[PDB]
Amino acid sequence: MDFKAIAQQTAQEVLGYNRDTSGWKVVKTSKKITVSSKASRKFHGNLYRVEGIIPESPAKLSDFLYQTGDRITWDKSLQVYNMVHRIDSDTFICHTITQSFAVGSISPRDFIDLVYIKRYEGNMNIISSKSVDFPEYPPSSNYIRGYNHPCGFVCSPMEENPAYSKLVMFVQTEMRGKLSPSIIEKTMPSNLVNFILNAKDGIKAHRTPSRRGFHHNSHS
C-alpha cells in the first residue's frame, strides 16, 4: 500500500477532527450549518470545518458526493471529474475541475485529491481527500491543482440515523494562488456551506423529482 497508507490514516485524521471539536471558531453559520475555523497545520493558515444536518440517510449522502456520476453534474462549484489512478475499490484519486472561485478574485481550480472512502459501521461514511502529488496528472496555470492538504468529507448517521444525517466536512486548503486573507475568508467558509448546499440540493435531486432541471450528463 501507499496511497492507502496515507489516506487510510488520513480518513481517521480528518475524522479525527470530527471528534476534535475545540480550539476553533465558527466563521460561518446559517440555520443548519456550522463552519468552524481551527488550524491547517499543513499550511500557515487555519482549517475550516463545516457541519450541517441533512434530513436524509447518510446513504444518499454518500450516494451524491460519491465520485463522478452526478457530483460534478448537478453541483454549483463542480465542473469536471476524471478518474486518474484508482488504487483499489475504496481508494481513488480524483482529477476534479472545480469552480471554487469567489466571484472574481479566484480562478477555477484543479483538485487532485487522493480520496479514501470509509464506512465506520453506522457512525460515518466519509470520503477522505488529499491533494496528492502523483504523476498521473500535472495541472496548468489555467487550472491550479488545489493543495487541499489531508482533508475529507464525513457523513455521520445522526440520532435519527436514516431520517437525519450529519454532514461534516473539513478542509485546510493552501490557496497557493494569488489570494488575500479576506479572499480566503470568502473562499473556504462559503465553499464548505456550498458543499453542503450541493448536499441539500443533490440529495433532493436524488430524492425529489428535481431532475427536470437536468444540468449536464451525470454519467456523461
Write the SSE topology:
Blueprint: H1 3-18, E1 26-29, E2 34-37, E3 48-54, H2 58-64, E4 78-83, E5 91-98, E6 109-120, E7 124-131, E8 144-145, E9 148-158, E10 161-173, H3 181-207
Helix pairs in contact: 2-3
PDB class: transport protein
Keywords: Steroidogenic acute regulatory protein (StAR), START domain, Cholesterol metabolism, Steroidogenesis, transport protein
Assembly: monomeric
Q: Number of helical segments?
A: 3
Give the distance, in angstroms, between the N- and C-terminal Cα atoms: 31 Å
What is the domain tally?
1
Q: Can you tell me the CATH class? A: Alpha Beta
Helix/strand order, N-terminal first? HEEEHEEEEEEEH
Which strand-content bin applies to the residues? 25-35%
Largest sheet data: 10 strands, mixed
What would you call the quaternary organization? monomer
What Rg do the Cα atoms give?
A: 16 Å
CA-based shape: globular
Q: Helix proportion of residues, in percent?
A: 10-25%
User: What is the correct CATH architecture?
Assistant: 2-Layer Sandwich
The CATH superfamily name is: START domain
What is the CATH fold-level name? Alpha-D-Glucose-1,6-Bisphosphate, Chain A, domain 4
Number of strands: 10
Find the structural class using helix and strand composition: alpha+beta
Give an overview in words.
Keywords: Lipid transport, Lipid-binding, Transport. May be involved in the intracellular transport of sterols or other lipids. May bind cholesterol or other sterols. With 220 residues, the protein is an alpha+beta fold. 23% of the residues lie in helices and 34% in strands. It is built from 3 helices and 10 strands; from the N terminus they run αβββαβββββββα. Strands 1, 2, 3, 4, 5, 6, 7, 8, 9 and 10 form a 10-stranded mixed β-sheet that branches.
